[PDB]
Amino acid sequence: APVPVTKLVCDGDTYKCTAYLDFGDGRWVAQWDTNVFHTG
């Protein structure tokens, strides 16, 4: 079931974002691949 994200971080060294979930012990994450770049 959908749960809220408590903290969203991204990492320019791994090109991933990590969403910490409000669930369980607080250490469940959703993590996905991203592009990372310097925009205008």
Kindly list the residues in this chain that would bind a second copy in the complex (CB under 8 A): 1-5, 7-13, 15, 17-19, 21, 23-24, 27-40
Alpha-carbon span 37 to 23, nearest angstrom: 31
As measured in angstroms, the least distance from the Cβ of 31 to a second copy is 5
As measured in angstroms, the least distance from the Cβ of 6 to a second copy is 10
Closest CA to 7 of 16, 23, 17, 20: 20
Maximum separation of any 2 CA atoms in the chain, in Å: 39
Q: Which residues are annotated as a binding site for Zn(2+)?
A: 11, 13, 22, 25, 38
Q: Which residues are annotated as a binding site?
A: 11, 13, 22, 25, 38
